[PDB]
């Protein structure tokens, strides 16, 4: 329904406003019948990817219910319970002639198929199965086994391999978490002195940052000045120094109001000459007086943290319900700290 | 009344489903009540013409002999390894399950690499029926879904016309240029295994079964394809050929076909392998053999003229007399700098037309309060930001390495990337720019045959880049004997053919300190 | 009726079509709309020639004599046509190619098509795709609409009564908004064998047609079209070339069109060189043709009105026929001051010469700057920045005491501030202008240079050497500086274009400095 | 001819002198020779769709009129025709020369006479009303009551300065 054409001649999304009226379905008037037809017993089901492209009068008649993506465990279950059997029925293979063990499927999900859907996992599964079928029917083998070592001989080279730019963080960088369609994502915030001395200072940002993210950098810079002034009143860093802030992978565009606390921590660690805790990610919008504000995409950020080997995660206190609605296996080995003001993040990170 | 018989006879060799038969009976009984002069009779007869010209059960008898199909594929095109392996697996599966099937593939790669001709070769190898279908610049959904019978200029759209032309229900449809489509939400239904089995053309108003059509889409890039449409179809890369593959193609497919097209004989017109290598190396610069075909055809045309006109009885083209046919070389430089001055460094880039070699020049804008860096050369925003990152890191590195230089913090520098008319972009050349700045600052030149590529971060980390094959080929062609790649491109480099990485002393790096110790 | 097809070799599918439409025609009745629409459909289907080719004379020497006598110059087109004839001989069949001539306005791209079709004895059709925006003007309407016409290629096949008629498609640069799809399928060797017009559903073959296309610039053509056709360059002419064209072709044609003959109206060659140098500024002979037509028309009037029995146009009375001599300058500066240098530019209309002026912007010898005006593109502004940097470096290494270009505030202007201009060339020109201003020296007096410059001084190739050289010759220059890598482009020019030109091929700017001073 | 909508190819064939002799119309099955008719076509802009017309069409440019030529045209052709159309005559309603020059200079500045025509018709209608109603048995227009006929002047003094101070200089647009 979010893909109907609003052409110059024809807007069917305005003729839907009568077909989907919970009260006026009982008399839906067709232009050929010229007789109202009772449609109140029909179960209409619409499907969409984005909700904002539907007009609000129409979006109000529907009961929008959400079909979320799948985490790695759900994907493994989906695979070994629906995809591999259906792939065998299609490619006509048997369980005894080519077996995809749970270790191989877990590796395939972990390295190749990372999005929310389950449509690329299907393609990799049937790729493996059709390569096995060609080995079998051509006489090159009578039975094929797929192991986590010869898997790259079937599907190619891994797509995801690193998960972490910095393994030990220097005194200027700090790990932040991002939302992506390919699962979560981990990103760092580098800071560096730009001029040969510790007339006021300045901050230059790079890394394809949107406008909201540039404003977040400005706010974080101002609050970092204020905080370092109240904390170590004689530091004079961040007041006279010329800083450069970079969010690496400078080719991909990134935006959002999060990473406020991340930028504050980067600047403070650069000013104090101290690295932050060595396995610590954080996400949260900062305000001008230091308040830590809620963020979005908690499931993806927590997944990415746990996947990059993070041991301590920091979230805003207003995301506690978001965090505790997560499944048990997602948030089991993470030392989470919920915060309201930044001073708590500072105490955690040092 | 005879038209009732003509319609009832067309459905004799067909196995028509029940709903189509209901619609046909209704429309026939209705037609048996109209007047041969009213428009109702015309539209009902058109509907019954289109309803019966659908091959409701007619499949083609596919060739499922793996050896015969492999021989058919291998003697039509050259070296399209992934596509041939895919089609062989397709045959293997259709043979192991005993029944025909259908898939949705997408061949993407640079222009002129035989994407749209391997489709015909595959249709011949599979004994299917072939249909061309272009979508580039299309804007009307009624070309895919058709209009109601009510309107006057109402046709059933392109897929129904395909099924009527090919007369089989499992053709091979080549949906050409899906990356340049102007309209695209109809393809989301056309090629989707869920909805594919009941495809609703708005003219027919009766669903067809496209579940056994082999769809093949072609593109040059995958970035302009909508995300759900990329989610539907399977991507298979058809990359461009190296000079040796271009030579094999010219020797085996391009010269014989151009002789056939020019009406020559092998004894009359001859082209040695040296002439073909000269053409490939100097008169054409692209990824696939498309301009090479034109050069070959030109040479053979001028040979045909020298024969028919009465000059000679046989033409024997040599690397000497090749000028008299195609003129003078077009791409005979291969490198801009032979000995790099103390401030220029050789970088690597690539495009759809292969790889290239570009130099990063730096100098002083003013003699001998901080410094500035002006960059020129038609750089995109990503490249300008990479230049800023490189400037900051070079300042810091020179501060920690030679603390008493005072360069790079007090000097005004201009950075240029020649070919100032060509727009350039990308996060690579960060290390190249750092090396250029440091070499200008220290007054030293870099190693003499050295190229480097890699994105740098603010603390000096070297990040992976793309197009290792093309950059390596271009560096090898430009006479480079030492190449510095990011460490995380090690598998990309080692998955290259042996004849590319033969004489290259490659170095994989993670931090810039390693590149500095190499280049100095 | 069925007699229009006994001379034709009708395919089988179209035979079924005409049979079923005859059945429909017979079952229907007169004075009815359907009767008339089926009558029109059958008339169009029986008017298409379904098996006939025109007798094409593949004789080489006769066709060369035909081509060489009605068109001066244009060696590439005639060589390509002769190779086409040779290949048609070897193949034994009548074949078809797809060609495209591109060049400045009025250089013979359209008349060479007619003379070519006369040489090959094919038929001839021309129609422009300039302003068209809907594809029905090519593919035709549908037989159901109230007013139905089968397009503009079926009309060709019907009126020419042939299957290889040499369709000329003029002016394919101009295209509305995209019928380029219909164009490409019409110009595709894989989609030509089956055309499938919209009015008549049955396809027709076009693989024997010779499609010639004319354009002014290749870049406005879509990139898809830029691969289904070869590119032959029809180039502009020089004064003597234009004069030969005039005498041999324009005066006889315009005269025979006006009615007079060789005795009643003459034009001395001096009058023609006047109409070429002054009354016209172009690379073609279009405006020259208009001037000759105007002269001969006023002559015809003076004859019939009884003022004189014969007219002899001389330089003494040309004003009475055309008026006053526009274009009486031919170059901005005659003797350049210390600051200005002549550069060469080009465009689709042909070559052109321009100057680069510099000046002080503030009164003295805290660093200097450089304002740049002249409606310059982005690449040209960047080239000016590069030139500024390299000029400062060079003046420091060569005259380390000048201090100009370091403390001076300069303004650089390229005159005709109304016309926009772009390009990486004129970098060496800008360097030379800055250095001549800083040294207070004027460059050599008849000297033009073209070439991209790099930050270290290397001289990089440029484009359009032919047109720039034509324009420099016409503006009366004696020396010319080119990049060393454009030597192969320069030595493809005819021997009469580069006669009084002293040429220098350079690689670094130091050579340009030695030449200009 | 530039306001035409296939009529384009139809005209292209019609004007051709090799297809001129045989113009078969859909009504009369008999052909008719049109090789003796003379064809003229007018337009305003030469940016119409067919270019091969302009190869066969001979373009002639009709320029505008300066105020003197417009005044002469108005006194010789326009005012007589307007009088005929309004039923007046030179004795009843008179338009002197100075009022016509004033009307052209202050109301109608385009290159044609399309506006001056409507202006003189306006004057003559007001005059017809004034003589029929009975306000005046004969009307005489004069540069001090023309605004009572056509309203407010469109153009103005045309000189912002009469004596230029040290800073200002007059250019032409
Ligand atoms: N490996 C090959 N073997 C034989 N012929 C080849 C090969 N590669 C290219 N060709 C030749 O190239 C010609 C044209 O290639 P084709 O048009 O299929 O390229 P393409 O990738 O489809 O281009 P585009 O993407 O622009 O459509 C064909 O005639 C084909 O014979
Ligand atoms: B944050 O939650 O807003 C976050 C900031 C990040 C740069 C540290 N941004 C994102 O997660 C965005 C999605 C988004 C979420 C909420 C508002 C606006 C945007 N994604 C990315 O920034 C991103 C980063 N790297 C790669 C891909 N996407
Ligand atoms: B690099 O990979 O980012 C490289 C840097 C180069 C300018 C030294 N850029 C390119 O290779 C680009 C392609 C590209 C890569 C990544 C993102 C976006 C674009 N190629 C060119 O800039 C280019 C320029 N001239 C000729 C050929 N290619
Ligand atoms: B040069 O070859 O790039 C040249 C430099 C010129 C500005 C002194 N540029 C041009 O000649 C351009 C065409 C062009 C060339 C290369 C890239 C882009 C464009 N032509 C003009 O600028 C021009 C301006 N006025 C009149 C005629 N031509
Ligand atoms: N070599 C030549 N011999 C005779 N006429 C020529 C020659 N070159 C150009 N012309 C004249 O040029 C005109 C055709 O120009 P054309 O190719 O139509 O330019 P365009 O199509 O770009 O406006 C004709 O009048 C023709 O007489
Ligand atoms: Mg293609």
**Would you list the DSSP string of D73-133?**
HIIIIIHHHHHHHHT--TTTEE--HHHHHHHHHHT--SSSSHHHHHHHHHHHHHHHHHHHH
SS3 state at C100? strand
- Interatomic CA distance for residues B405 and B411, integer angstroms: 11
Instruction: Please list the residues that pair with C355 across neighbouring strands.
Output: C342
- Kindly state the tokens that stand for B368: 């001998």
Beta strands in chain A (DSSP E): 28-29, 36-37, 98-99, 144-145, 174-179, 184-193, 202-206, 242-246, 280-282, 285-286, 292-293, 312-316, 335-339
DSSP secondary structure code for residue A286 in this structure:
E
Closest among C49, C57, C56 to C162, alpha carbons compared: C49
DSSP secondary structure code for residue C252 in this structure:
H
Burial of A228 (0-12, 13-18, 19+ CB in 10 A): buried
Closest among B403, D123, B416 to C386, alpha carbons compared: B416
For the structural domain made of B344-519, what CATH number should be given? 3.30.230.10
- Interatomic CA distance for residues B47 and A182, integer angstroms: 48
- Interatomic CA distance for residues B191 and B214, integer angstroms: 10
Chain A contact for B389 (CB, 8 A cutoff): yes
Query: Strands C125-128, C167-170: parallel, antiparallel or unpaired by DSSP?
Result: parallel
Burial of C432 (0-12, 13-18, 19+ CB in 10 A): buried
Residues 6+ apart with CB under 8 A from B148: B154, B202, B203, B205
For C388, nearest residue in chain B (alpha carbons): B365
Contact indicator for B382, A251 with CB cutoff of 8 Å: yes
Closest among C272, C233, C213 to C467, alpha carbons compared: C233
Measured CA angle at C403 (ends C398, C406), to 5 deg: 105
- Interatomic CA distance for residues B32 and D14, integer angstroms: 47
Write down the architecture of domain C239-322 according to CATH: Orthogonal Bundle (1.10)
Question: How much of chain B is helix, strand and coil, in % rounded to 5?
Answer: 40, 15, 45
Q: C-alpha distances in angstroms, C459 versus C399, C431, C453, C511? A: 22, 12, 5, 10
Query: Strands B412-416, B372-376: parallel, antiparallel or unpaired by DSSP?
Result: parallel
Same-domain pairing of A102 and A223: no
B243-326: CATH topology:
Helicase, Ruva Protein; domain 3 (1.10.8)
- Interatomic CA distance for residues B135 and B173, integer angstroms: 12
Q: Looking at ligand 1, which atom is closest to the CA of residue B76?
A: 4
Residues 6+ apart with CB under 8 A from B311: none
SS3 state at C459? strand
Instruction: Please list the residues that pair with B351 across neighbouring strands.
Output: B354
Alpha carbon of B209: minimum distance to chain C alpha carbons (Å): 26
- Interatomic CA distance for residues C447 and C436, integer angstroms: 13
Q: Which residue has the tokens 């690193």?
A: A162
Burial of A33 (0-12, 13-18, 19+ CB in 10 A): exposed
For chain C, what is the total number of helices (H) and then of strands (E)?
Answer: 18, 16
Q: C-alpha distances in angstroms, D125 versus A79, D130, D138? A: 91, 9, 13
Same-domain pairing of A119 and A255: no
Q: What residues of D are in contact with residue C128 (Cβ under 8 Å)? A: 50-52
C367–B364 CB contact, under 8 Å: no
Backbone gaps in chain A, preceding residues (C–N over 2.5 A): 198
- Kindly state the tokens that stand for D136: 């005046």
**Would you list the DSSP string of C462-488?**
-S-HHHHHHHHHHTT-SEEEEEGGGHH
Write down the architecture of domain C60-233 according to CATH: 3-Layer(aba) Sandwich (3.40)
- Interatomic CA distance for residues D66 and D108, integer angstroms: 11
Contact indicator for B236, B105 with CB cutoff of 8 Å: yes
* Domain that residue A261 falls in: 173-349
C456–B301 CB contact, under 8 Å: no
Q: Centre a 10 Å sphere on the Cβ of residue A17 and count the other Cβ atoms it contains.
A: 15
Same-domain pairing of A246 and A133: no
Same-domain pairing of A261 and A341: yes
Q: Which residue has the tokens 């970092």?
A: A224
Q: C-alpha distances in angstroms, B495 versus B474, C125, C421? A: 17, 56, 47
- Kindly state the tokens that stand for C515: 């030449």
Resolution as reported, in Å: 3.2
Instruction: Please list the residues that pair with A245 across neighbouring strands.
Output: A191, A205
Contact indicator for C275, C229 with CB cutoff of 8 Å: no
Contact indicator for C449, C382 with CB cutoff of 8 Å: no
Instruction: Please list the residues that pair with B364 across neighbouring strands.
Output: B413
Closest among C47, C304, C318 to C157, alpha carbons compared: C47
D51–C171 CB contact, under 8 Å: yes
C170–D51 CB contact, under 8 Å: yes
- Kindly state the tokens that stand for C74: 């244009």
- Interatomic CA distance for residues C456 and B448, integer angstroms: 17
Same-domain pairing of A116 and A247: no
Query: Strands A98-99, A36-37: parallel, antiparallel or unpaired by DSSP?
Result: unpaired
Closest among C303, C263, C295 to C279, alpha carbons compared: C295
Considering only residues 7 to 26 of chain D, which have any Cβ-Cβ distance to chain C shorter than 8 Å?
A: 9
Instruction: Please list the residues that pair with C230 across neighbouring strands.
Output: C99
Contact indicator for B25, B137 with CB cutoff of 8 Å: no
CA dihedral sign of residues C418, C424, C426, C432: positive
Q: C-alpha distances in angstroms, B100 versus B159, B214, B326? A: 19, 10, 50
As annotated, the active-site residues of B are 428, 471
**Would you list the DSSP string of B328-380?**
S-SS----S-SS--TT-EEEEEEETTEEEEEEEEEEESS-----EEEEESSB-
- Interatomic CA distance for residues D14 and C277, integer angstroms: 39
- Interatomic CA distance for residues C37 and C21, integer angstroms: 10
Ligand 4 lined by C283 (C-beta under 6 Å): no
- Interatomic CA distance for residues A204 and A243, integer angstroms: 6
Furthest C-alpha separation in chain D: 81
Q: Where are the domains of chain B?
A: 66-237, 243-326, 344-519
| CATH number of domain containing A85 | 1.10.8.60
Q: How many alpha carbons lie under 13 Å from residue B153 in its C-beta half-sphere?
A: 14
Contact indicator for D32, D23 with CB cutoff of 8 Å: yes
- Interatomic CA distance for residues A177 and A314, integer angstroms: 10
Pairs across A and B, CB distance < 8 A:
104
Among A91, A119, A250, the residue with its CB nearest the CB of B427 is A250
Same-domain pairing of A197 and A343: yes
DSSP secondary structure code for residue B252 in this structure:
I
**Would you list the DSSP string of C297-360?**
HHHHHHHHTTS-S-EEE-TTTTHHHH-S-----SSS-SS--TT-EEEEEE-SS-EEEEEEEEEE
SS3 state at C212? strand
- Interatomic CA distance for residues B481 and B491, integer angstroms: 20
Contact indicator for C33, C41 with CB cutoff of 8 Å: no
Q: Centre a 10 Å sphere on the Cβ of residue A343 and count the other Cβ atoms it contains.
A: 14
Which H/E stretch holds residue B463?
A: strand B462-463
SS3 state at C505? strand
C110 labeled binding residue? yes
Output the CA torsion C402→C407→C413→C414 (10° steps).
40
The residue of C128, C168, C171, C214 whose CB has the most chain D CBs within 10 angstroms, and thus the best one to mutate to test that interface, is: C128
Alpha carbon of B97: minimum distance to chain A alpha carbons (Å): 5
Ligand 4 lined by C383 (C-beta under 6 Å): no
How was this model experimentally determined? Answer: cryo-EM
Among B341, B376, B377, the residue with its CB nearest the CB of C456 is B341
Contact indicator for B119, B174 with CB cutoff of 8 Å: yes
Beta strands in C191-292 (DSSP E): 211-215, 230-233, 265-267
Burial of C93 (0-12, 13-18, 19+ CB in 10 A): exposed
Q: Please provide residue B83's backbone torsions phi and psi, each rounded to the nearest 5 degrees.
A: -65, -45
> Does residue C28 come out as left (phi exceeding 0), alpha (psi in the -120 to 50 range) or beta?
beta
For the structural domain made of C340-516, what CATH number should be given? 3.30.230.10
Q: Please provide residue C344's backbone torsions phi and psi, each rounded to the nearest 5 degrees.
A: -115, 135
- Kindly state the tokens that stand for D35: 């090789």
Instruction: Please list the residues that pair with A185 across neighbouring strands.
Output: A178
Chains that touch D (3 or more CB pairs under 8 A): C
Q: What residues of D are in contact with residue C149 (Cβ under 8 Å)? A: 6
Q: Centre a 10 Å sphere on the Cβ of residue C506 and count the other Cβ atoms it contains.
A: 20
- Interatomic CA distance for residues B457 and A165, integer angstroms: 10
As annotated, the active-site residues of C are 425, 468
HEC assignment per residue over B85-108 = HHHHHHHHHHHHHCCCCCCEEEEE
Domain B66-237 grouped into CATH 3.40.50.300: yes
């Amino acid at each position: 329904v979010d893909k109907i054409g609003r052409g110059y001649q024809g807007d069917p999304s305005s003729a839907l406003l009568e077909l989907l009226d919970p009260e006026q379905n009982a008399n839906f008037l067709d232009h050929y019948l010229d007789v109202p037809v009772d449609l109140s017993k029909v179960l209409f089901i619409c499907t969409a990817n984005v909700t904002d492209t539907i007009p609000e009068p129409l979006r109000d008649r529907m009961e929008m219910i959400n079909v979320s993506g799948y985490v790695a465990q759900e994907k493994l279950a989906i695979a070994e319970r629906y995809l591999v059997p259906q792939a065998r029925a299609l490619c006509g293979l048997d369980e005894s002639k080519a077996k995809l063990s749970s270790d191989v499927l877990t590796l395939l999900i972990k390295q190749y198929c990372r999005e929310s859907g389950v449509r690329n996992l299907q393609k990799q599964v049937e790729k493996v199965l059709r390569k096995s079928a060609y080995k079998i029917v051509s006489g090159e083998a009578e039975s094929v086994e797929v192991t986590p070592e010869n898997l790259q001989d079937f599907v190619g080279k891994p797509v995801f391999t690193v998960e972490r730019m910095y393994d030990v963080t220097p005194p200027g960088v700090v790990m932040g978490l991002a939302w992506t369609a390919m699962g979560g994502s981990t990103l760092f915030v580098e800071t560096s002195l730009r001029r040969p001395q510790d007339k006021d200072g300045s901050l230059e940002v790079t890394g394809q940052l949107g406008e909201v993210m540039k404003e977040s950098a400005r706010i974080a810079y101002t609050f970092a000045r204020a905080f370092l002034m109240q904390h170590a009143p004689a530091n004079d860093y961040l007041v006279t120094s010329h800083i450069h802030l970079h969010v690496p992978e400078g080719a991909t565009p990134k935006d959002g109001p999060s990473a406020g606390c991340t930028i504050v921590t980067a600047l403070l660690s650069l000013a104090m000459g101290r690295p932050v805790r060595q396995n610590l990610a954080m996400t949260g919008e900062v305000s001008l007086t230091g308040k830590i504000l809620p963020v979005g995409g908690i499931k993806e950020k927590t997944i990415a943290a746990k996947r990059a080997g993070v041991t301590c995660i920091v979230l805003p206190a207003e995301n506690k319900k978001d965090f505790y609605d997560l499944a048990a296996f997602i948030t089991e080995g993470l030392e989470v700290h919920f915060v309201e003001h930044y001073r708590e993040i500072f105490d955690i990170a040092f | 009344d005879a038209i009732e018989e003509k319609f009832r006879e067309r459905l004799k060799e067909l196995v028509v489903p029940k709903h189509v038969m209901d619609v046909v009976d209704e429309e026939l009984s209705k037609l048996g009540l109209l007047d041969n002069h009213s428009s109702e009779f015309n539209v009902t007869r058109n509907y019954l013409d289109w309803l019966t010209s659908i091959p409701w059960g007619k499949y083609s008898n596919e060739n499922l002999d793996l050896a015969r199909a492999q021989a058919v594929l291998e003697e039509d095109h050259y070296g399209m390894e992934d596509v041939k392996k895919r089609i062989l697996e397709f045959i293997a599966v259709s043979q192991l399950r005993g029944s025909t099937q259908g898939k949705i593939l997408c061949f993407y790669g640079p222009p002129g690499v035989g994407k749209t001709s391997i489709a015909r070769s595959i249709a011949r190898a599979l004994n299917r029926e072939y249909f061309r279908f272009s979508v580039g610049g299309m804007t009307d959904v009624a070309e895919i879904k058709g209009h109601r019978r009510t309107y006057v200029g109402a046709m059933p759209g392109k897929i129904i016309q395909c099924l009527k032309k090919t007369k089989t229900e499992n053709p091979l449809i080549l949906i050409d240029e899906v990356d340049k489509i102007g309209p695209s939400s109809a393809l989301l239904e056309l090629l989707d295994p869920e909805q594919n089995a009941n495809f609703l053309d708005h003219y027919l108003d009766v669903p067809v079964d496209l579940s056994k059509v082999l769809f093949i889409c072609t593109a040059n890039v995958t970035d302009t394809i909508p995300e759900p449409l990329r989610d539907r179809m399977e991507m298979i890369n058809v990359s461009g050929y190296v000079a040796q593959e271009k030579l094999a193609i010219a020797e085996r497919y391009l010269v014989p076909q151009a002789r056939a097209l020019c009406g020559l004989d092998e004894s009359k017109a001859k082209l040695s392998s040296d002439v073909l290598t000269l053409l490939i190396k100097q008169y054409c610069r692209e990824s696939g053999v498309r301009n090479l075909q034109k050069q070959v055809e030109k040479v053979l045309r001028k040979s045909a003229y020298k024969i028919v006109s009465g000059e000679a009885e046989s033409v024997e083209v040599t690397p000497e007399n090749l000028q008299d046919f195609v003129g003078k070389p077009v791409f005979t430089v291969e490198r801009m700098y032979d000995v790099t001055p103390p401030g220029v460094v050789m970088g690597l880039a690539w495009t759809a037309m292969g790889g290239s070699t570009l130099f990063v020049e730096t100098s002083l804008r003013r003699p001998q309060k901080d410094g500035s860096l002006e960059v020129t050369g038609q750089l995109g925003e990503v490249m300008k930001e990479s230049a800023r990152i490189a400037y900051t890191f070079a300042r810091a590195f020179l501060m920690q390495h030679a603390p008493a230089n005072d360069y790079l913090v007090t000097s005004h520098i201009h950075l240029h990337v020649p070919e100032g008319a060509t727009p350039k972009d990308g996060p690579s050349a960060g290390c190249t720019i750092v090396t250029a700045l440091l070499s200008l600052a220290m007054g030293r030149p870099v190693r003499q045959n050295l190229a480097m590529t890699g994105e740098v971060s603010l603390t000096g980390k070297i990040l992976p880049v793309g197009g290792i094959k093309e950059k390596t080929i271009a560096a090898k062609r430009a006479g480079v004997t030492c190449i510095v790649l990011p460490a995380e491109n090690k598998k990309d480099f080692y998955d290259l053919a042996a004849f590319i990485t033969e004489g290259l002393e490659v170095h994989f790096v993670e931090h810039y300190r390693e590149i500095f110790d190499i280049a100095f």
